[PDB]
Each structure stands twice: as C-alpha cells, then as structure tokens.
Ligand SMILES: *[C@@H]1O[C@H](CO)[C@@H](O)[C@H](O)[C@H]1NC(C)=O
Ligand SMILES: *[C@@H]1O[C@H](CO)[C@@H](O)[C@H](O)[C@H]1NC(C)=O
Ligand SMILES: *[C@@H]1O[C@H](CO)[C@@H](O)[C@H](O)[C@H]1NC(C)=O
C-alpha cells in the first residue's frame with residue numbers, strides 16, 4: 001500500500017526480467033568473443049540493444065518512485081542505481097552527437113596508423129608495432145620520432161573532438177544534478193545515508209591528495225634511481241637536476257615503468273624467479289594451471305569451481321580456423337554461470353593472470369545471493385584489488401616452492417628480494433603519480449578550473465610538478481597530449497587504478513595478519529589459511545549492498561584509504577633506495593634542463 | 596500371497612512432461628500395492644528428505660491414500676519444499692503444512708527440461724496477495740494489483756502479470772538448473788487402508 005512496498009514489488013519484477021535479459025546479452029557477447037563471426041556480431045548487437053532498451057524503459061518506470069520516503073537502504077540503493085538517467089537527459093540531437101563523438105574517438109584510437117614519412121606503401125599500427133618500439137628500443141631519436149609523430153597526428157585529429165566532448169559531458173552531468181563530469185565520476189565512491197560511514201563526492205580528491213603526499217617521498221627516491229640508471233642508458237641527454245624525458249619511460253605514455261627492468265636492474269647477476277622452464281619440463285597444460293589456481297583458492301577456504309565453469313570456459317586458444325579475442329577476461333554471465341576467456345600460454349605470467357582472473361570469478365561467485373543490481377564491487381577499486389592480491393600471493397617464492405615449480409634448494413637472499421621489489425615498484429609505484437596527475441587534470445578540466453586555451457601548458461606543468469617527467473619539445477593547443485591514452489579517449493574513469501593499488505596492499509596486510517605471517521609483507525602467502533579466506537569472504541559476500549567504507553572496515557578495520565600498507569610493502573626497497581641515492585640528487589626541478 | 600497390481604509410480608516419476616509449480620500436478624494413489632524399492636534404487640536423487648515417517652519403514656506401515664505431487668522448480672528453491680519454509684515457491688506456489696507426513700524427492704533434469712534457446716514452458720507465480728494455504732493451487736492469471744489504482748485487467752505500472760517463466764538453459768549454474776520434484780503425502784482416514792506394501796514369507 002505504501003511507496004516502499006511498491007518499490008519492493010517493482011524491484012522483484014525488475015530483478016527477474018533483468019537476470020533473464022542480462023543472461024541472454026552476456027551469452028551473446030560470449031559467443032561473439034570466443035567465435036568472431038558476423039552472425040555472432042549481429043546476435044550480440046541485438047541482445048545488447050534489447051538490454052539497453054530494457055534498462056531505458058525500466059529506468060523510466062523506476063523514476064516514478066521518489067527516494068525521500070524509502071527507509072530501507074538496500075531498496076534505496078537499488079532504486080538509486082536504477083533511476084540514473086545517464087545520457088538520456090539530453091535532447092535527442094545532443095545525445096546522438098555525443099554517441100557519434102564517442103564512436104569516432106573509438107575508431108580514431110583503434111585504427112590510428114602512424115608511420116615514417118617518405119615510406120607510405122605500408123604503415124604500422126599502435127598495438128602491433130608502436131608498443132614494441134616503445135618498450136624495446138634503446139634509440140633516443142627513434143623513440144622521439146614515434147612519440148612525437150603519434151601525439152602530433154592523434155592530437156590534431158582528436159583536439160576539437162575532446163573540445164566538444166568536455167562540453168557535452170559537462171552538460172550531461174549538470175543536467176544530472178552533478179557539479180561537473182568529474183563529480184559524476186567521483187559519485188561512484190559517494191556514500192549517503194549511513195551514519196559514521198558517510199563518504200562525499202568532494203572528499204575523494206583531498207583523500208587522494210592526502211595519500212599522494214605520503215606516496216611522494218618513495219616515488220622520488222625511485223625516480224632518482226631510475227634517472228641514474230637512465231643516465232647510464234643515455235649519457236648526455238638527461239640532467240642530474242631535471243626531470244625524465246617523456247619518451248624514455250618504457251611505454252607510450254609513461255603509465256607503467258615495468259619495461260625498464262632490463263635497464264634499471266639492481267643485481268643483474270642474480271637470476272629471476274621465472275618458473276616457465278619448470279612448467280615446460282613437467283608438461284603443465286592450461287587445464288592443470290587453472291587446477292593449481294583452484295587448489296590455491298580451496299587452500300584459503302573459498303569454494304571451488306563449478307562444473308559449468310570447467311565445461312564452458314575456453315582456457316586454450318582454439319586454433320587458426322576459429323578466431324577468438326585473446327584478452328584475458330572473467331565472465332559472470334548470470335544464473336550461476338561463471339566462465340574465463342583466456343588464451344593460456346605455458347608461462348609464469350599466464351599462471352599469475354589465471355590466479356587474477358579466478359580471483360575475479362570468486363568475487364563474482366560470492367555475491368550471487370545479492371539482488372541483480374547490487375552484484376558488483378562496493379566501488380570500482382575492489383574488483384581489481386581482490387584479483388591483484390591473488391596475483392601478489394601466487395608470485396611469492398614460498399608458493400612456488402609449495403606447488404613444485406620452484407626447487408626446495410632455492411636461496412632467497414636479500415638481493416633477489418630487492419630486484420623483485422624493484423620490478424613490483426616499477427609496475428605499481430610508477431603508475432601512481434601518472435594516475436593521480438591524469439585524474440586531477442581531468443577533474444580540473446571538467447570543473448573549468450583550467451582555461452580552454454591553457455590545457456597543454458597546465459598539463460605539462462603538472463607532469464613536471466607531480467610525475468617529474470618533462471616534455472621533449474613544447475606543445476601548443478594544436479595538440480591533445482592527454483587523449484593519446486586508451487582510457488581518456490574512450491570515456492573511462494581512471495582513479496580506479498589508484499584506489500585499487502591502495503586497496504590491494506590494504507587487503508594484503510589484513511589477510512597476512514589474519515594468516516599470522518611473521519616476516520616481511522612481500523613474502524606473505526595466504527595459502528592454507530582458512531581464517532584469512534573467511535575474513536576476505538566476509539567482504540566478498542556483500543557485493544554492493546554495503547558501503548565500501550563498511551566493507552573496508554570489515555577487512556582492514558579502517559573505513560578510509562590508507563597508504564601505510566603500500567609503504568610497508570616496499571620498506572626494504574625504500575631503505576635500499578635511500579642507501580643508493582646518497583650520491584644522486586633526490587627530487588627534480590621543473591626547468592627544461594635535460595631537454 | 597502373490598504380488599501384483601503395483602502402484603503406478605512409473606507414471607509419476609518417469610513422465611515425459613512435468614507440470615509448472617504454480618499448476619502443480621496431483622495424482623491420487625489408491626487400491627494398489629506400493630513398493631518403494633524402485634525409488635530408493637534410483638541414484639540421481641538430489642533430495643530424498645522424508646518427514647514423519649522413516650524411509651526404511653515405508654514398505655510395512657501402510658496408508659489409505661497416497662498423493663503424488665509433481666512439478667519443476669529451480670535448484671535453489673528445492674529447500675523451500677519443506678514444512679515451515681518461506682520463499683516465492685512456498686508462499687505463492689506450493690505450501691506444505693507444518694504437520695506434513697510424507698517425503699519430498701527431487702532430482703536434476705537438465706537433459707529433459709533445458710533448451711539452448713531457453714525452455715519457457717515452466718512457470719511460477721511471483722506475485723500473490725496472500726500466502727497459499729497448505730496443498731492449495733492457484734491457476735488464476737489475474738493481474739496483480741500492487742498499488743492503489745485499479746488494474747482493469749491491463750498490466751503496466753503497479754500492475755504486474757503474476758506468472759513468470761523459468762527460462763531454463765543447459766549452461767546455468769546448479770542452483771538454477773531445472774529440478775523435478777515429486778512430493779508423496781500419505782493420509783489415513785476412517786476408510787480401510789488399501790495402499791499397502793509387499794509381503795514376504
Ligand atoms: C564458430 O562459428 C562457426 C561459424 O561458421 C561454427 O561453424 C562453429 O561451430 C563455431 N564454433 C563452435 C565451437 O561452436
Ligand atoms: C530491506 O529489504 C530486504 C528485502 O528486500 C529485507 O530482507 C531487509 O530486512 C530490509 N531491511 C530493513 C532495514 O527493513
Ligand atoms: C531523469 O530525467 C527526467 C527527465 O526530465 C527527470 O524528470 C528526472 O528527475 C531525472 N532523474 C534524476 C534522478 O535526476
């Protein structure tokens with residue numbers, strides 16, 4: 001009779017129809033992804049169309065229930081998720097123009113071909129060739145040519161597109177009662193209505209700032225060390241007092257520093273912990289790799305894989321005749337159906353990735369009891385964080401000695417720990433200032449703090465001030481240097497990586513104190529510990545029903561992002577970097593002294 | 596005494612077509628000799644939980660009428676076919692009394708009730724004004740009036756069709772695969788009990 005009971009009945013009908021239609025959409029997407037054929041393309045398009053039309057009409061019927069008279073938190077959360085207008089709030093012409101702009105940005109990024117002048121007979125694409133030339137080459141002018149050419153072409157073809165994109169997204173967010181599009185993206189972390197666990201959209205930026213201020217000393221030492229090693233690579237081009245040249249960061253954009261392990265190795269004489277040879281000698285097929293990951297997950301106490309998982313997942317590349325997407329993806333199709341799309345190779349990297357995707361599947365499996373619209377992570381960071389903790393635990397020497405990949409006579413001295421921690425630092429600590437800088441630039445450009453004709457000058461200045469990376473040559477407003485990255489060009493939130501990185505080490509400390517680990521954090525394994533699995537599964541079972549602050553309090557006993565686990569993880573590497581940066585200068589200057 | 600005139604349990608358990616849980620099928624069994632050996636012999640059973648009588652002494656204690664109720668539900672709801680339970684199936688589709696004397700039998704039926712396109716021929720009642728009484732069926736297709744405005748027979752806002760389809764597919768998880776359930780309810784009346792098991796000598 002009341003509004004709340006009407007909302008509950010409406011949500012029951014929505015949940016049944018949503019799970020059926022979502023299952024059909026997910027099955028069609030799976031059939032396209034494992035079998036790239038045009039009938040599968042049109043089937044996936046038809047199912048996606050029916051799903052999008054279904055959510056459009058259900059949101060239209062859902063906005064007839066006002067939220068101010070609903071007291072149950074779960075029903076209020078489901079209705080808040082359902083009643084979001086999205087892009088529908090605009091006029092049909094502006095919405096169509098926005099979708100056209102997003103599609104053409106996607107096609108420009110996917111089909112962007114940049115090649116050498118005077119040799120136009122064939123040209124090289126970004127994903128096959130530019131990644132290889134950015135990650136493997138040691139030539140300064142070659143990397144400069146690739147970097148400047150790609151940014152020049154992509155920036156000139158994408159700058160007015162981004163110019164219209166910021167205005168259209170800003171109008172969409174302000175029509176949706178948000179301050180800006182950055183506020184719309186920060187709304188994923190917003191918690192309202194729960195006493196003590198309340199989290200605002202506005203608070204996130206200072207929280208990120210508060211974490212980054214403590215990130216900054218460790219990164220500075222790492223930056224100094226990397227600079228010194230790059231001085232060995234490039235003798236005269238890099239200055240001791242200045243920033244790093246932008247096209248020397250090992251990637252196209254400087255997002256990851258993991259390609260510099262060869263140049264910046266602490267101890268090249270020491271071997272690595274690569275166990276690929278042990279797999280190929282013992283004939284470890286992909287099925288048994290996933291079986292080992294399942295054994296790890298049942299050691300910690302989580303439930304094992306379903307029978308339908310083993311029957312329906314395609315864990316091996318099918319062949320030349322059948323084309324499939326090779327990207328590792330964990331699929332929650334709904335209705336108890338969980339699959340992994342992975343073209344497994346017999347390597348340690350695929351083994352760790354299998355652990356990561358099975359962590360994704362376990363996270364999806366735990367919240368199956370939740371209502372359909374609450375079947376997600378509590379925020380965007382948790383879902384990747386719970387897979388990255390499995391990737392952390394599986395990569396330890398203790399776990400590799402446990403399952404027979406690593407010999408019991410392997411000596412774990414401090415030098416291999418230092419080089420392993422430096423590899424982890426180049427992957428993890430390296431991406432944090434880039435992520436925070438990119439998100440903060442996007443937040444100010446959506447907010448209007450940055451003037452329209454001052455974008456590049458502001459962006460490069462922050463790259464000098466935050467990341468400590470200098471541009472090779474000055475760029476004017478004909479360029480759109482942020483837009484060369486995949487996430488910004490295709491309308492993706494980027495702060496999930498920063499929050500995921502913090503939540504990863506927070507969860508790792510919570511599980512390691514749960515499992516009674518008496519050593520350094522990077523050696524810790526959560527195997528054979530039921531209590532750590534129970535502590536994690538308490539968060540996994542909630543899904544999106546509870547605030548992310550409450551889920552974090554359930555795991556780590558804190559309701560806010562903490563950077564102390566991450567610095568505690570990298571503590572011996574931090575002491576080592578402090579030791580060997582005595583001769584070098586820690587910190588950078590914003591001047592263009594290197595170039 | 597020779598053994599003949601066995602009760603038709605083949606008709607109930609081995610039927611080619613079961614019924615939806617909203618219109619659950621009820622078959623009365625009388626004037627025959629019921630042997631429970633065949634049921635116990637059958638391996639695929641997911642639940643053989645019995646209430647009020649032991650499964651071992653089914654063949655000797657004997658009753659006046661035996662009711663076999665057959666329907667198809669999803670695996671997650673098999674726990675709801677019990678006395679004292681709540682859910683969609685218990686409240687709106689099939690209710691057992693708190694003093695239920697009988698057995699519930701359930702088994703997986705993927706090979707018979709799952710279709711790749713989706714089997715949309717199994718239905719259940721999702722909305723009903725009041726809970727079902729024990730051993731009651733509701734086959735009405737009246738539009739559920741959830742609000743204050745009259746439905747007038749047309750669905751829409753705050754007016755939902757109560758029967759929703761169990762879209763069974765072979766790739767579903769074990770909690771969502773189709774399960775065939777047969778409920779045996781035994782009753783004694785003032786009439787002479789004529790459903791009695793076999794005799795040995
Ligand atoms: C993949 O699609 C092709 C389309 O011609 C079909 O013949 C083939 O059976 C499909 N593969 C599988 C495993 O179903
Ligand atoms: C909210 O609704 C759910 C069912 O929709 C119920 O289980 C829960 O107890 C309700 N919470 C409160 C606080 O009433
Ligand atoms: C969604 O857009 C409609 C169209 O005007 C509006 O009436 C409604 O209030 C919007 N919903 C929200 C949550 O802003």
Ligand SMILES: *[C@@H]1O[C@H](CO)[C@@H](O)[C@H](O)[C@H]1NC(C)=O
Pocket residue numbers: 304305306307
């Ligand atoms: C999962 O584990 C249970 C017991 O721990 C076992 O009965 C079941 O067979 C396992 N699943 C598979 C697919 O083997």
Ligand SMILES: *[C@@H]1O[C@H](CO)[C@@H](O)[C@H](O)[C@H]1NC(C)=O
Pocket residue numbers: 414415418576
């Ligand atoms: C490793 O430990 C030995 C033990 O004295 C020490 O001499 C050496 O400097 C340490 N090396 C590193 C990289 O910590």
Ligand SMILES: *[C@@H]1O[C@H](CO)[C@@H](O)[C@H](O)[C@H]1NC(C)=O
Pocket residue numbers: 299398399402525527528
């Ligand atoms: C976990 O338990 C199994 C079975 O008892 C054992 O073989 C394995 O060595 C254990 N793992 C560790 C790291 O001790």
Ligand SMILES: *[C@@H]1O[C@H](CO)[C@@H](O)[C@H](O)[C@H]1NC(C)=O
Pocket residue numbers: 604605608609633634637
């Ligand atoms: C059903 O068919 C099977 C097939 O062999 C048979 O063994 C069984 O006795 C039949 N009856 C019942 C009640 O299962």
